Amino acid sequence: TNDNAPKFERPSYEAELSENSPIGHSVIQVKANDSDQGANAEIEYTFHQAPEVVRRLLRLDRNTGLITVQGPVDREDLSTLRFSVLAKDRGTNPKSARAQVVVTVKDMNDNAPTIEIRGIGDVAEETAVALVQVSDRDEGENAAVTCVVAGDVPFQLRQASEKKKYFLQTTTPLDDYTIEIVAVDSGNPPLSSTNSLKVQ
Ligand SMILES: [Ca+2]
Ligand SMILES: [Ca+2]
Ligand SMILES: [Ca+2]
Ligand SMILES: [Ca+2]
């Protein structure tokens, strides 16, 4: 008869996993142990109680305790996957044991900075003429954006001090102009977008 509980090799498991990992990719391996012999020591791993998301993104091998990728991890959609692995042997009285598991989703530079523009209408030098707002959905460096007017044109950007906002203003006056704004991450590889604009 079934004398022992299964026992995880660790009460709790931490893990890092970069978003957009390929399907099939190994995430982590869990192991439990039964001092017993026979079926009374034959462990199945299962997480039927795990959140829909976890079950949607991850596959847990019933026999080995290998968690591998089966869906699209988006750090931008969900940044941490926390759940619990159940291990029970095959006694007819099947003694169980439970280990909790945390996967922190690592950021990838998968998001090009976005730049939204609205106008304000001799004209004075240093005069604000548009509102430019810039935002990158990524994290840290991958969202450290650099924004500049492409060309040689008598306009430049100036920050509304410390979603980043900027005044597109005047560098000298006169008395009509197309103006291209350029945005670039400080992540590797960096991504980039532009937005044209006709002064009004
Ligand atoms: Ca047992
Ligand atoms: Ca993403
Ligand atoms: Ca990202
Ligand atoms: Ca980015």
Residue numbers in the entry: 216 to 336, 350 to 390, 396 to 408, 414 to 438
Quote the study that presented this structure, word for word:
Protocadherin-1 (PCDH1) is a non-clustered δ1 protocadherin involved in respiratory diseases. PCDH1 has seven EC repeats (labeled EC1 to EC7 from N to C-terminus), a single pass transmembrane domain and a cytoplasmic domain with the three conserved motifs (CM1–CM3) typical of the δ1 subgroup. PCDH1 may bind bronchial epithelial cells and epithelial cells of the airway mucosa together by mediating homophilic adhesion and helping in forming the epithelial barrier. Here we use bead aggregation assays to show that repeats EC1 to EC4 form the minimal adhesive unit for human (Homo sapiens [hs]) PCDH1, despite its longer extracellular domain with seven EC repeats.
The first two, PCDH1 EC3-4bc at 3.05 Å and PCDH1 EC1-4bc at 2.85 Å, were obtained using bacterially produced protein. The PCDH1 EC3-4bc structure (T216 to Q438) had one molecule in the asymmetric unit, had poor density for three loops in EC4 that were not modeled, and it was used as an initial model for phasing the PCDH1 EC1-4bc structure by molecular replacement. The RMSD for the shared Cα atoms among the chains of PCDH1 EC1-4bc and PCDH1 EC3-4bc was also low (~1.5 Å). Crystal contacts in the PCDH1 EC3-4bc structure are not expected to reveal a physiologically relevant interface as their areas are small and repeat EC1, required for trans binding, is absent. Nevertheless, some of these contacts could represent low-affinity transient intermediates for both trans and cis (from the same cell) interactions.
